[PDB]
Each structure stands twice: as C-alpha cells, then as structure tokens.
Design a protein around this motif. Structure first.
Motif, PDB file in Angstrom:
ATOM      1  N   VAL A 227       0.909  -1.197   0.071  1.00  0.00           N
ATOM      2  CA  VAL A 227       0.300   0.004  -0.288  1.00  0.00           C
ATOM      3  C   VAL A 227       0.830   1.490  -0.015  1.00  0.00           C
ATOM      4  N   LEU A 228       0.444   2.151  -0.715  1.00  0.00           N
ATOM      5  CA  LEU A 228       1.387   3.325  -0.992  1.00  0.00           C
ATOM      6  C   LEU A 228       0.663   4.692  -0.547  1.00  0.00           C
ATOM      7  N   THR A 229       1.226   5.229   0.519  1.00  0.00           N
ATOM      8  CA  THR A 229       0.541   6.495   1.093  1.00  0.00           C
ATOM      9  C   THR A 229       1.619   7.693   1.156  1.00  0.00           C
ATOM     10  N   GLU A 230       1.004   8.779   1.138  1.00  0.00           N
ATOM     11  CA  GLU A 230       1.744  10.097   0.993  1.00  0.00           C
ATOM     12  C   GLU A 230       2.500  10.222   2.523  1.00  0.00           C
ATOM     13  N   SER A 231       3.808  10.775   2.302  1.00  0.00           N
ATOM     14  CA  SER A 231       4.987  10.527   3.305  1.00  0.00           C
ATOM     15  C   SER A 231       5.356  11.948   4.057  1.00  0.00           C
ATOM     16  N   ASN A 232       5.996  11.825   4.896  1.00  0.00           N
ATOM     17  CA  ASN A 232       6.522  13.124   5.753  1.00  0.00           C
ATOM     18  C   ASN A 232       8.084  13.132   5.477  1.00  0.00           C
ATOM     19  N   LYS A 233       8.626  12.042   5.462  1.00  0.00           N
ATOM     20  CA  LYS A 233      10.002  11.800   5.180  1.00  0.00           C
ATOM     21  C   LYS A 233      10.768  12.682   3.939  1.00  0.00           C
ATOM     22  N   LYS A 234      11.741  13.283   4.277  1.00  0.00           N
ATOM     23  CA  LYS A 234      12.455  14.328   3.194  1.00  0.00           C
ATOM     24  C   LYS A 234      13.539  13.766   2.920  1.00  0.00           C
ATOM     25  N   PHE A 235      13.762  13.480   1.495  1.00  0.00           N
ATOM     26  CA  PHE A 235      15.029  12.724   0.905  1.00  0.00           C
ATOM     27  C   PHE A 235      16.046  14.040   0.671  1.00  0.00           C
ATOM     28  N   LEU A 236      17.360  13.575   0.823  1.00  0.00           N
ATOM     29  CA  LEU A 236      18.339  14.278   0.334  1.00  0.00           C
ATOM     30  C   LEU A 236      18.542  14.159  -1.309  1.00  0.00           C
ATOM     31  N   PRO A 237      18.841  15.207  -2.178  1.00  0.00           N
ATOM     32  CA  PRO A 237      18.806  15.165  -3.498  1.00  0.00           C
ATOM     33  C   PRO A 237      19.345  13.811  -4.193  1.00  0.00           C
ATOM     34  N   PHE A 238      20.481  13.164  -3.474  1.00  0.00           N
ATOM     35  CA  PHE A 238      21.248  12.006  -4.034  1.00  0.00           C
ATOM     36  C   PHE A 238      20.444  10.568  -3.423  1.00  0.00           C
ATOM     37  N   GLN A 239      19.332  10.620  -3.092  1.00  0.00           N
ATOM     38  CA  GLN A 239      18.640   9.475  -2.396  1.00  0.00           C
ATOM     39  C   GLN A 239      17.424   9.101  -3.160  1.00  0.00           C
ATOM     40  N   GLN A 240      16.876   7.828  -3.413  1.00  0.00           N
ATOM     41  CA  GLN A 240      15.793   7.512  -4.121  1.00  0.00           C
ATOM     42  C   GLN A 240      15.056   6.416  -3.344  1.00  0.00           C
ATOM     43  N   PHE A 241      15.601   5.682  -2.475  1.00  0.00           N
ATOM     44  CA  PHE A 241      15.066   4.496  -1.716  1.00  0.00           C
ATOM     45  C   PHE A 241      15.339   4.780  -0.433  1.00  0.00           C
ATOM     46  N   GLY A 242      14.224   4.458   0.611  1.00  0.00           N
ATOM     47  CA  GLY A 242      14.421   4.585   1.815  1.00  0.00           C
ATOM     48  C   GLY A 242      14.436   3.161   2.601  1.00  0.00           C
ATOM     49  N   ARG A 243      15.185   2.776   3.546  1.00  0.00           N
ATOM     50  CA  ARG A 243      15.082   1.427   4.205  1.00  0.00           C
ATOM     51  C   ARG A 243      14.813   1.357   5.671  1.00  0.00           C
ATOM     52  N   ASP A 244      14.275   0.436   6.128  1.00  0.00           N
ATOM     53  CA  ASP A 244      14.031   0.235   7.736  1.00  0.00           C
ATOM     54  C   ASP A 244      15.126  -0.625   8.317  1.00  0.00           C
ATOM     55  N   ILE A 245      15.039  -0.893   9.570  1.00  0.00           N
ATOM     56  CA  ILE A 245      16.048  -1.793  10.222  1.00  0.00           C
ATOM     57  C   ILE A 245      16.345  -3.262   9.736  1.00  0.00           C
ATOM     58  N   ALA A 246      15.202  -3.660   9.213  1.00  0.00           N
ATOM     59  CA  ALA A 246      15.188  -5.037   8.643  1.00  0.00           C
ATOM     60  C   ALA A 246      15.497  -5.074   7.020  1.00  0.00           C
ATOM     61  N   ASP A 247      15.799  -3.797   6.766  1.00  0.00           N
ATOM     62  CA  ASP A 247      16.632  -3.530   5.305  1.00  0.00           C
ATOM     63  C   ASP A 247      15.470  -3.755   4.117  1.00  0.00           C
TER      64      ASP A 247
END
Ligand SMILES: *[C@@H]1O[C@H](CO)[C@@H](O[C@@H]2O[C@H](CO)[C@@H](O)[C@H](O)[C@H]2NC(C)=O)[C@H](O)[C@H]1NC(C)=O
Ligand SMILES: *[C@@H]1O[C@H](CO)[C@@H](O[C@@H]2O[C@H](CO)[C@@H](O)[C@H](O)[C@H]2NC(C)=O)[C@H](O)[C@H]1NC(C)=O
Ligand SMILES: *[C@@H]1O[C@H](CO)[C@@H](O[C@@H]2O[C@H](CO)[C@@H](O)[C@H](O)[C@H]2NC(C)=O)[C@H](O)[C@H]1NC(C)=O
Ligand SMILES: *[C@@H]1O[C@H](CO)[C@@H](O[C@@H]2O[C@H](CO)[C@@H](O)[C@H](O)[C@H]2NC(C)=O)[C@H](O)[C@H]1NC(C)=O
Ligand SMILES: *[C@@H]1O[C@H](CO)[C@@H](O[C@@H]2O[C@H](CO)[C@@H](O)[C@H](O)[C@H]2NC(C)=O)[C@H](O)[C@H]1NC(C)=O
Ligand code: NAG
Ligand code: NAG
Ligand code: NAG
Ligand code: NAG
Ligand code: NAG
Ligand code: NAG
Ligand code: NAG
Ligand code: NAG
Ligand code: NAG
Ligand code: NAG
Ligand code: NAG
Ligand code: NAG
Ligand code: NAG
Lengths: 171, 195, 344, 98, 47
Positions: A8-28
């Motif tokens: 499920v895709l939802t709107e986010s509040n995280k804010k990536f630096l310009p050189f970032q595309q994906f975000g990972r949690d602790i379980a990778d």
C-alpha cells in the motif's frame, strides 16, 4: 525504477536528500520511495496483518465453526460477516452467540472469555471463578466439627519415558 | 474401571509423534533436485552429484539435531517429575506429612503406591471434618481473680454452660484444674468471661 | 575506581560455656516480601510471513520445509498452554470465593492495605496497585489495528514491526481482575477461618484466638499473646506500613527481567532479517528482480535456510526459559499451599 | 486450513491458530522517469573507428531508453554475457551510472 | 581417605569434554574443499 514489490502506497513526511531514491528500515526492506515523475516521497506498507484463530466443537459432532480475528475492533478486515458478531479484548469473534450466564471454561478464547457448543449452536461467555461464599465471622463465635469423613484420592505422576537410539549412517 | 490417565498417555503420544515426524522429514529436498539418493546417484556423476548429496546431508543432520535437543528438554521435565514422585514416596508413603496439600486434600493419614505404565499412582487417605456446629467462645476463664487458659483445647459454650473441647472434634468436657493452666489476673485479657 | 577484597560479613563470637544459656525476653513481629515469577508472554509465529512475506515464489519454494514449521508451532503452543496451567495451579487453589464481612473487628489488626479497594475500577488492594505500577509491560492491551499503524508508524513502533513479520502475542486466559479476585478470596478465607478452609469447609474463629493457635505452633504459650495483644497488633500494623512505604518509595527486578527478556528475543528476531546468510542481498525483491527463476532459487534457498535456523534458535531458547518459569511456578504453588493455607 | 495443516480429515474440539489475514493485490503499476530519447546504439556499436586496447575508450550514457531490440537487424554478436543480472530481466530494469 | 565424589567429577569431565569437542570440530570441511582458511585463500581468488 525496476524495483518490484507489493503493498500500500501512502503520502509521506520523510524528506530525502537530492542524491537519495529509496528508503530502508532496520530489517533492510524498502519502506519509502521517491516517485520518479512527481518527485514526491511515498511510504510502502505491507498488506497482510492480524492473527486468526478458528474455534471448532470437533468435526465429529458438527462442521459449525467460529472465527476469532485477534486484531479487529467492530463497533472490516474479516473473511465473512454472518451474524453474531461479538467484540472481546481478545478480538472480534464471529459465529458464536453471546450469553449472560457463566460456566466453567470449555474452550478458552482468552481475556476471560470461553466458548462451548450448547443450545445446537456455539455460545461465548465469561468464565466463572466459582461459587460465592461468606463466613459468619464474629468476635466470639467458633465452629467445631462433629463428624468426619475418610477420603481417598488419586495422584498420577510420570516417572520415565521411552529410551531411543539412532543410527546416523542408516538415517 | 468406568471412565483417565491422560498425563501418562501424553508421554507415549509425544515420543511416538517425535519418531514419526523424524520419519516423514525424509521427504524434504532441502534445496536439492530430489529427496531420494538413488535418483541423484543415477542421472548424475560423482563431482556434480556431491553438491546435491551435501544439501541432503546437511538437512538430515539438522533434523536429527532438532530431535535430540527436544528430547533433552523433555527428559529434564520428566526428571523433575520423577524427583517429585520420589519425594512423595518417602514423605507420604514411608511417613505422615504435615505439609498442607502435599499428600492430598485434608489432613493426611496415609498413602499407598500403585505402579502404572511409565509412572506411579498414589492413593492418599486423608481425614476431612464434617457437620460443624456454632458455639460461643472465649479466650480465658476468670475464677478467683485468676485467668485460666486451656491446655490443649478451646473454651466453648452450648448457650448456658461452658466446656473445654479439642479443636478438631466436638467432645465437650467440664473445665477443671487439669484441663487448664493459670497465668496472671483477670485485668489484661480482652474477652475474658466469668465461670 | 578502586579495587578491593570483598568482605564476607561482620565478625562475631558466641559466649559459649558449659553452663550458660541465653533466653529472649521480648519479641518482634516481622513482615517480609518474596517475589516469584509465574508466567511469561505467550507468542506465536507465522513461518510463511516471517521467511517469505508476500513473495509467492518464496512461498512455493518453502513447501519443502513445512514439517519444520508445524514443529515450531507445536512447540510454541505447548508453551502457551503451559503458561495458563501455571497461573491456575498458583492462584486457583480454592474454588469458593469467600468475602470478608463488614465486621472489621480483628482484635486490633489492620488489614486495610491488603484488602480490596471498592473505590477502584478493579478491586485491587493498595499494595497490589503499588506493585502494578512498578512493572512496565510492552502491550497495553492486545488489539492493535491495521489502520492504527499505517504509514511510517510501522518500523518506528516495535510492536507493528513485529506484527508485520508474523510475530503475534496472545492474551492470557485469566484477566488481572480475576487474579485479584482469587487473591482476595484467599485473604478473606485466611483471616476469617485460619487454616481450616484449606482442608475442608471454612470454620470461623476469632482472629486473636487464631493468632494464639499460631503462637502455640512455634513453641510459645497462648498467654504470651493474650497478655501482649495490643503490642503485637501495633507491631504488625507498623510492619505493614513499612512495606507500603518502602515500595511506593523505591523493586520488582525479577518480574521485570521476564518482560525484558521476551521483548528482547522478539526484537532480535526482527533485526535478524537483515542478514544475507551468504546470498547477494537480504531482500527478496532485489533478488527476484534482476534475477530469473532458476538462478534466483539458489539465493532464495540460502535466505530460507538462514531464516529457518533463526526461528529454530528462538523456539529452543523459549523452551528452555519456559522450563525455568515452570519450576518457579511450581515453587510458588507449594508456597501458596504451605505458607498461606497453613503454618510451616 | 486447519484440516490441512493437521494433515488429517478430522479435527478435535478446540481452538487452532491459522495463517494471518491476507489481502490480495488488485492492480499493477509501473513508474519510470520521463525519458524520450533512445540510447546511442548507433554511435557505440556502429562507430567507424575503435580505440586500441591499451588506450581503451570510456563513454558516459545517460537520459535515454535502452531498447536494444533495434540491434536485431544490423548487428550480430558472437559473445554476449552479463554478470550480476539476468538477460531476460534487462527490459524491466533501470540502470545507474552507465 | 581410603576409597568417591563421582557426582562432582562428572561436572568437570563434562565441561572439559565439551570444550575439547569444540576444538576438534575445527577439522571438518562442512562440504568445502579443505578445512584450513589458508589453503583456500591461497590457490583461490576472492569471489
Ligand atoms: C457421622 O456420619 C455417618 C455417615 O458418614 C453417620 O452414619 C450413617 O448414618 C445413617 C443414618 O443412621 C446411615 O443410613 C448410614 O448407613 C451411616 N453411614 C455409615 C457409613 O455407616 C453417623 O451417624 C454420623 N454420626 C453422627 C454422630 O452424626
Ligand atoms: C448445655 O449443656 C448442659 C449439660 O451439662 C445442659 O444442662 C443439663 O441438661 C440436662 C438435660 O437437659 C439436665 O438433666 C441437667 O440437669 C442440666 N444441667 C446439668 C448441670 O447437667 C444444658 O441444658 C445445655 N444448654 C443448652 C442451651 O443446650
Ligand atoms: C553473656 O555473658 C558474656 C560473658 O561476659 C558476655 O560476653 C562477652 O562480652 C565481652 C564484651 O562485649 C566480650 O569482649 C567477650 O568476648 C564476650 N565473650 C566472652 C567473655 O566469652 C555477653 O555480653 C553476655 N550476653 C548478654 C546478652 O548479656
Ligand atoms: C518490648 O519491646 C517493645 C518495643 O518493640 C517495647 O515497647 C516500646 O516501649 C518504648 C518505651 O516504653 C516506647 O517508646 C515504644 O513506643 C514502645 N513500642 C511500642 C510498639 O509500643 C516494650 O516496652 C518491650 N517490653 C519489655 C518488657 O522490655
Ligand atoms: C513528466 O511528464 C508529465 C506529463 O507527461 C509532466 O506533468 C506535468 O506537470 C506540470 C507541473 O508543472 C503540470 O502542470 C502538467 O499538467 C503535467 N502534465 C500532465 C500531462 O500531467 C511532468 O512535469 C514531467 N516531468 C518533469 C520533471 O517535468
Ligand atoms: C466505542 C467504545 O468502545 N468506546 C469506549 C469508551 O466508551 C470508553 O470510555 C473507553 C475507555 O478507554 O474505551 C472506548
Ligand atoms: C448472618 C451471617 O453472618 N451469615 C449468614 C447469612 O448471611 C445467611 O443469610 C444465613 C442463612 O444461611 O446464615 C448466616
Ligand atoms: C465482686 C467484685 O469483684 N465486684 C467488682 C466491683 O467491685 C467492681 O466495681 C467492678 C468493676 O471493676 O468489677 C466487679
Ligand atoms: C492514612 C491513610 O492512608 N488513610 C486514611 C486517612 O486518609 C484518614 O484520614 C484516616 C482517618 O479516617 O484513616 C486512614
Ligand atoms: C546495408 C544495410 O542493410 N543497411 C541497413 C538497411 O538495410 C536498413 O533498411 C536500415 C534500417 O534497419 O539499416 C541499415
Ligand atoms: C468419531 O468417529 C470415529 C470414526 O467414525 C468413531 O470411532 C468415534 O467414536 C467418533 N467419536 C465419538 C466421540 O463417538
Ligand atoms: C474497540 O474500540 C472501542 C472504542 O473505539 C474501545 O473502547 C475498545 O477498547 C476497543 N476494543 C478493545 C476490546 O480494545
Ligand atoms: C444480558 O446482559 C445484558 C447486559 O446489559 C442485559 O442488557 C440483557 O438484558 C441480558 N439478557 C440478554 C440480552 O440475553
Ligand atoms: C452459624 O451462625 C450463623 C449466624 O446466623 C449462620 O449464618 C450459620 O448458618 C451458622 N452455622 C452453622 C453451621 O450452623
Ligand atoms: C466484641 O465486639 C462487641 C461488639 O458487638 C464488643 O461489645 C465486645 O467488647 C467485643 N469483645 C471482644 C473480646 O473483642
Ligand atoms: C466477673 O466477676 C468479677 C468478680 O466477681 C466482677 O467484678 C466482674 O464484674 C464480673 N464480670 C462480669 C462481666 O460480670
Ligand atoms: C487502618 O490504617 C489506615 C492507615 O493506612 C487508617 O486509615 C485506618 O483508619 C485504620 N483502621 C482503623 C480501624 O483504625
Ligand atoms: C549501421 O550501419 C548499417 C549499415 O549502414 C545500418 O543498417 C544501421 O542503421 C546503422 N546503425 C545506426 C545506429 O545508424
């Protein structure tokens, strides 16, 4: 961008630096992604969630069952809705009728609730702890027995189990 | 003879189920091409059949390891149960126990052992009071400015007269100087009565 | 930082002679606490959801290891029913719910801090409330809905992180109010009946005469109680006040270690999903995309083996811990029958 | 589900745990960046002069769709091997630092 | 002083045997070409 998945895709509040595309949690696992056309960040949440238990009186007596969804609160993520929906601190129970009596536990549902195949249908109730009693206490009263009974009771205790051996090569 | 020994049947059931689970776990590939050594050894030549045989060997070794570990854990539990049974044999059968609810419900009188498949059964003979009755009571009796306490009993009253009885069985007796003992005067005990 | 040799204790010498004896002339009534663990958390695991997730290729590859998951879940359910059996042996000794009368005439002894408080939603004592707030659980309830952690609330709340990976915690059979009812019945029986309700029917007896019986049981005559009744009642009341005090002040470490250990085990399971186990990555979606079935199967096999052995390690250590908790609960049941329902 | 996890046709009285509540996906979506041009397949494979191996040439490739099927008419390669990726997956992916 | 404490010697024996078994289990290939890391790292390249 080639990364496949399900969720499920939802709107986010995280804010990536310009050189970032994906975000990972602790379980990778990938839990955030930047949309490559709108440049907006999205959160990816899994789709399956919540435990399920099935209560049967035995299929040698009936194929009626009740189902306990241990993570639902109805006042839905259920397989069916039928009738007799009953909410418990252990989850939503579907298929069993709630009564006001109280008996000894037959099938333990949990959080103080048991179920049984009575009248046929499946009923759910709050288990009783025992009969209520009161002692006639006063500051100058005593109770003395006048007869007795000789009681004989059994107690069973396991003492051994089977001695086994294994041949590795042969197994 | 009517209708059980569930705690003794669960041991047999658990051991049998463990062995049968071991046997059915011989149908797992563990990531190999088949679970039969004869399908691998025929249609494959040694150096490239060795990889498959290695997968099978690793899987089956870990199966045996799991079995042995769970057997050790179960044996620890059975050891605790057998130690409890030995203690009960020495303290309830070879003697009389004052420990509450250790040798049955009630006051323990005696016990008899019987042997059962993989276990023991104790028949505990206990004494249970019955048919109680209400009485008025008092801590002490005041006779001559002296307080009298019972030696091995309790003071009761049928409503008009006072007797001294034993605590566990109603057997009233006349209060004498052989039933009681004296200590102090009649000014300190709280619910003292005149008799 | 200093380093020293530890001392064993203060030195003492007894004035032993062949015709000298020392006899006490006064006494003290002491009240002490003893804490015992009786249960631990009941958990369950969904293999498919932990090892594979929503991967259908992985779930089809896993069908060669179904016996191992049935085995794991069998072990976990054994533990789970054993926990309820433990609580029942400790607290459900008597099956008559005795109440204490409004006659609070117990010879001067004050049992108000250990008797139920009808002013609460529950009917817990004062001391039971002080105890309840010194152990911080991890699950305030057992209904955490899907919509409640949807977004980034997951993987920031440890419980939703555990739940999204197939790790469930089941609620105990007896609620805390039922256990409070059981202890209330035990207290009422023991202060209005002495030790008779544990051997048959409860036979009432005034509390001072019961205390005199108990003084007889340790080798002191009854007149020693009856002539010092006010002093003994005051000493008992002061000792109970000291308990509440100490508690409300500052612990229950042996009961918090159980919660801590179970939580740490589950969280270790969750973080062990970041191991490659010798594969090219630890994510099934990076393998299944950029690799085609027959040569992605080797990597998925490595991951499956690793995660299976992780689950196996967890279940084994849970079995060992459950054996220890079982021993503790047996000791607590023995203490309940021999110290509370009698005199030892 | 319980009959099948028990590997038996009869179930005895009780309560049994089953699998977690599953939801199936309803749609499929693809999100690639806005790229219009085609990659320079004809000035890399169809160049007029190549470099010497001791002074090999390195070229940067960016911002183009990698539709290699256009090489099917005019090119025939005797060696083609990829490492770290499958040839059958090259059409679904998206490549960094080419 | 004549002639035992077998139950106390079995503990020592068991712990020593466990450690020594750990040490000898370093001679297993586990399906590799050798049980020495230096025979693998020399004669074979990283990947
Ligand atoms: C004590 O209890 C016993 C019963 O356990 C009483 O004996 C019974 O008396 C009834 C009526 O007389 C008979 O029908 C039964 O056959 C008797 N039972 C046995 C086992 O013999 C006895 O009378 C009671 N004693 C007192 C003083 O009440
Ligand atoms: C309390 O018990 C005494 C027994 O000592 C009862 O008094 C005797 O009762 C018998 C029969 O009624 C008479 O023959 C005696 O003369 C009575 N006195 C004595 C000194 O023995 C007395 O009735 C009982 N009281 C109650 C309320 O039951
Ligand atoms: C009992 O009598 C003994 C004998 O005097 C007392 O003990 C001695 O006390 C002195 C001073 O505290 C010590 O230096 C000695 O070592 C003790 N032991 C001896 C002399 O053998 C003791 O205080 C008396 N106890 C009570 C309760 O009065
Ligand atoms: C036995 O010990 C108690 C103390 O536990 C003594 O009672 C104390 O007496 C002092 C002085 O009279 C008072 O200040 C305290 O308030 C008393 N304590 C309590 C709890 O009431 C008692 O005197 C001692 N008895 C003997 C014979 O020495
Ligand atoms: C990718 O192309 C889409 C259209 O195919 C662009 O979307 C436009 O975005 C602007 C915002 O400035 C809107 O006003 C237009 O209505 C959008 N067009 C459509 C058809 O939705 C998008 O801007 C392009 N990507 C970039 C980085 O410019
Ligand atoms: C719909 C519903 O159940 N509402 C209840 C609310 O009445 C109650 O006060 C609260 C207590 O925490 O729990 C919730
Ligand atoms: C009066 C008292 O203290 N206790 C009981 C009372 O509750 C009960 O109603 C009566 C009849 O059984 O017997 C007595
Ligand atoms: C015969 C006898 O002892 N009578 C006394 C009386 O004198 C005294 O006033 C009363 C209160 O103590 O107790 C009684
Ligand atoms: C001291 C305490 O904890 N509780 C009460 C206190 O509030 C009250 O003033 C007193 C007399 O009613 O009885 C006690
Ligand atoms: C010599 C030769 O064949 N050149 C080819 C031509 O035939 C073809 O029409 C064109 C488009 O594919 O590419 C080039
Ligand atoms: C359940 O079925 C079997 C076979 O049909 C039968 O032997 C058994 O007695 C049945 N159960 C009961 C409780 O009758
Ligand atoms: C269900 O929701 C109500 C109010 O929304 C809440 O009070 C209740 O606690 C929930 N169910 C349970 C048993 O937690
Ligand atoms: C059952 O208990 C509820 C509690 O409010 C009560 O309203 C009802 O009358 C009782 N009888 C039923 C509904 O069976
Ligand atoms: C004792 O007396 C009380 C007070 O009326 C009553 O409740 C109870 O039934 C009596 N007990 C017996 C055994 O007669
Ligand atoms: C018992 O309580 C009564 C109140 O009904 C009181 O009058 C009497 O003095 C008390 N006696 C004792 C010994 O506590
Ligand atoms: C007990 O007897 C003494 C002396 O005869 C008397 O002073 C006292 O008041 C009596 N007690 C009662 C309660 O009658
Ligand atoms: C018992 O002690 C409490 C103090 O915690 C006090 O509130 C209460 O009044 C006492 N009870 C009696 C009967 O004095
Ligand atoms: C390469 O040359 C051939 C023959 O002239 C032609 O078919 C092809 O289109 C050329 N490739 C490109 C990329 O122009």
């Amino acid at each position: 961008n080639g990364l496949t998945g399900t969720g499920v895709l939802t709107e986010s509040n995280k804010k990536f630096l310009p050189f970032q595309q994906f975000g990972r949690d602790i379980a990778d696992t990938t839990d955030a992604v930047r949309d490559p056309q709108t440049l907006e960040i999205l959160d990816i949440t899994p789709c399956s969630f919540g435990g399920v238990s099935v209560i049967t009186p035995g299929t040698n007596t009936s194929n009626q069952v009740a189902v306990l969804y241990q993570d639902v609160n109805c006042t839905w993520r259920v397989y069916s809705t039928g009738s007799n929906v009953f909410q418990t601190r252990a989850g939503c129970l579907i298929g069993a009728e709630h009564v006001n009596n109280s008996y000894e536990c037959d099938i333990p549902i949990g959080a103080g609730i048991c179920a049984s195949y009575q009248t046929q249908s499946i009923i759910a109730y709050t288990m009783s702890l025992g009969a209520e009693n009161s002692v006639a206490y006063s500051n100058n009263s005593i109770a003395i027995p006048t007869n007795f009974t000789i009681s004989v009771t059994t107690e069973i205790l396991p003492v051994s189990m089977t001695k086994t051996s294994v041949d590795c090569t042969m197994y | 003879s009517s209708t059980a020994l569930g705690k003794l049947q669960d041991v047999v059931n658990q051991n049998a189920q463990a062995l049968n689970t071991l046997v059915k776990q011989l149908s797992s590939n563990f990531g190999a091409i088949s679970s039969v050594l004869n399908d691998i050894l025929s249609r494959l030549d040694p150096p490239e059949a060795e990889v498959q045989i290695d997968r099978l060997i690793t899987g089956r070794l870990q199966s045996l390891q799991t079995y042995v570990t769970q057997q050790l854990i179960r044996a620890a539990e059975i050891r605790a149960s057998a130690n409890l049974a030995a203690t009960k044999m020495s303290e309830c059968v070879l003697g009389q126990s004052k420990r509450v609810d250790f040798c049955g419900k009630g006051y323990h009188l005696m016990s008899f052992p019987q042997s059962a498949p993989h276990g023991v059964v104790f028949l505990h003979v206990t004494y249970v009071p019955a048919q109680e009755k209400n009485f008025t009571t008092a801590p002490a009796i005041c006779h001559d400015g002296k307080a009298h306490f019972p030696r091995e009993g309790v003071f009761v009253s049928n409503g008009t007269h006072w007797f001294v009885t034993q605590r566990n069985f109603y057997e009233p007796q006349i209060i004498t100087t052989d039933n009681t003992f004296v200590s102090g005067n009649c000014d300190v005990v709280i619910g003292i009565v005149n008799n | 930082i200093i380093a020293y040799t530890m001392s064993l204790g203060a030195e003492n010498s007894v004035a032993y002679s062949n015709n000298s004896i020392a006899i006490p002339t006064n006494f003290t009534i002491s009240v002490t606490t003893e804490i015992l663990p009786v249960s631990m958390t009941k958990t369950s695991v969904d293999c498919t959801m932990y090892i594979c997730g929503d991967s259908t290729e992985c779930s089809n590859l896993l069908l060669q290891y179904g016996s191992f998951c049935t085995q794991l879940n069998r072990a976990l359910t054994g533990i789970a029913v054993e926990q309820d059996k433990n609580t029942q042996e400790v607290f459900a000794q008597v099956k008559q719910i005795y109440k204490t009368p409004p006659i609070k005439d117990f010879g001067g002894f004050n049992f108000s801090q250990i008797l139920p408080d009808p002013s609460k939603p529950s009917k817990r004592s004062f001391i039971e409330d002080l105890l309840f707030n010194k152990v911080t659980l991890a699950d305030a309830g057992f209904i955490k809905q899907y919509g409640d952690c949807l977004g980034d609330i997951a993987a920031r709340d440890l419980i939703c992180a555990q739940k999204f990976n197939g790790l469930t915690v089941l609620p105990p059979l007896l609620t805390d109010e039922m256990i409070a009812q059981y202890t209330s019945a035990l207290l009422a029986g023991t202060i209005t009946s002495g030790w008779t309700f544990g051997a048959g029917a409860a036979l009432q007896i005034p509390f001072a005469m019961q205390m005199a019986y108990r003084f007889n049981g340790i080798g002191v005559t009854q007149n020693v109680l009856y002539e010092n009744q006010k002093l003994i009642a005051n000493q008992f009341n002061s000792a109970i006040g000291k308990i509440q005090d100490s508690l409300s002040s500052t612990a229950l470490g042996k009961l918090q270690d159980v919660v801590n250990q179970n939580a740490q085990a589950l969280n270790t399971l969750v973080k062990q999903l970041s191991s490659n186990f010798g594969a090219i990555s630890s994510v099934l979606n990076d393998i299944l995309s950029r690799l085609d079935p027959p040569e992605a199967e080797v990597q998925i096999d490595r991951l499956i083996t690793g995660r299976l052995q992780s689950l196996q390690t967890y279940v084994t250590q849970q079995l060992i811990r459950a054996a220890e908790i079982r021993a503790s609960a047996n000791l607590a049941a023995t203490k309940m029958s021999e110290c509370v329902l009698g005199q030892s | 589900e319980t009959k099948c996890t028990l590997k038996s046709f009869t179930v005895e009285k009780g309560i049994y745990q089953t699998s977690n509540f599953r939801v199936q996906p309803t749609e499929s979506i693809v999100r690639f960046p806005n790229i219009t041009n085609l990659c320079p397949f004809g000035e890399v494979f169809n160049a007029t002069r190549f470099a010497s191996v001791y002074a090999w040439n390195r070229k940067r490739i960016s911002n183009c769709v990698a539709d290699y099927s256009v090489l099917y008419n005019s090119a025939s390669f005797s060696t083609f091997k990829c490492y770290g990726v499958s040839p059958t997956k090259l059409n679904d992916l998206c490549f960094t630092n080419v």
